[PDB]
Amino acid sequence: GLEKTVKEKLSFEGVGIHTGEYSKLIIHPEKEGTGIRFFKNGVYIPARHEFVVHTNHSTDLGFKGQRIKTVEHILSVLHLLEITNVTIEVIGNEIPILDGSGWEFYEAIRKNILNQNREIDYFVVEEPIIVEDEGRLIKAEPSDTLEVTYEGEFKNFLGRQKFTFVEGNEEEIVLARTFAFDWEIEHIKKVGLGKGGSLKNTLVLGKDKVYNPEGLRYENEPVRHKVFDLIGDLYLLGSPVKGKFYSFRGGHSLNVKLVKELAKKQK
Ligand SMILES: O=c1ccn([C@@H]2O[C@H](COP(=O)(O)OP(=O)(O)O)[C@@H](O)[C@H]2O)c(=O)[nH]1
Ligand SMILES: CCCCCCCCCCCCCC(=O)O
Ligand SMILES: [Cl-]
Ligand SMILES: [Zn+2]
Ligand SMILES: [Zn+2]
Ligand SMILES: [Zn+2]
Ligand SMILES: [Zn+2]
Fold it and tell me: Tell me, what CATH number does 190's domain have?
């Protein structure tokens, strides 16, 4: 595929899910070979694994004293559309959460794609790898296409289930929203997070219930969202990725751990 940028400046704004603060996003076109980077208070922060500063309840980036929370959703959309050269200017401390999915980013950017004058240099998984953490497991292996499977095993009604993304099925995952369990809310608030969370941007689930009156868009919506998150974290390899991935109960911390091991092996 050819390198891509946006045809013009695109704007997005709203509350950040963790900070509870209003922020604003300006996506700027860039020339061939620039890569994906964030820009904040005069500082460029590359969308790369070396710049990850926190992974507990979001993927956060930082450099030279400037930090940006919650980059996983904008990065997943850029990965899915193969946008390879852009600057994401952030006025604020967090990416806006919007409805908790990738849909608004996806629809706006999809309409404004500009093919450029270079063949993409893909990060291609060259051999099988497995990373583990206390129950959680991710494996990666060589493939001509990006294929991503998440298997969840949840302690509520969701139980054990599985969803697989393959290339060409981007529309199946960009609408899936971020989710939280009711028993997790106290912890999240107590560590100084979740300040912008509500039923308008978060699916809140109990042992037996869905609090959002709109309910779930899909029966496996949370698992589709986890696939969407992993594709965002994978873009921290610095280029679009070619590989087959299986994740059992993974989250941002394990995703970033796999990315770091893949990077140092050097694919
Ligand atoms: O299939 C799963 C199951 C759990 N989790 C998350 O990972 C954490 C692990 O929780 P666990 O069931 O292991 O019990 P805990 O470690 O919180 O005591 C939970 O907060 C879940 O939000 C997940 O991402 N995928
Ligand atoms: C109805 C208001 C309650 C919302 C408070 C919870 C805040 C949502 C936190 C999002 C969960 C983290 C997801 C993640 O990034 O891995
Ligand atoms: Cl924490
Ligand atoms: Zn090509
Ligand atoms: Zn925590
Ligand atoms: Zn997240
Ligand atoms: Zn997410």
Answer: 3.30.1700.10
- Ligand 1 is surrounded, with C-beta below 6 A, by 135, 152-155, 184, 249, 251
Residue 230 Cα distances to 84, 242, 246, 252, 254, angstroms: 18, 13, 10, 7, 10
Candidates 73, 11, 63, 58; CA nearest to 38 is 63
Claim to verify: residue 222 and residue 239 sit in the same structural domain: yes
Ligand closest to CA 247: 1
How many angstroms separate the alpha carbon of residue 188 from the centre of ligand 2? Answer: 7
Contacts of 71 (CB under 8 A, 6+ apart): 38, 47, 58, 59, 60, 61, 95, 232
229 is annotated as contributing to ligand binding: yes
How far apart CA 216 and CA 48 sit, in angstroms, is 33
- The experimental method behind these coordinates is X-ray
DSSP 69-128: B--HHHHHHHHHTT--SEEEEEESSB---TTSSSHHHHHHHHTTEEEEEEE---EE--S-
Q: How far is the CA of 106 from the centre of ligand 3 (A)?
A: 29
Active-site residue flag, 252: yes
This structure's resolution (Å) is 2.2
Range of the domain at 6: 1-121
**CA–CA dist 123, 62 (Å, integer):** 23
In terms of DSSP H, where are the helices of the chain?
72-80, 103-110, 185-190, 221-234, 252-265
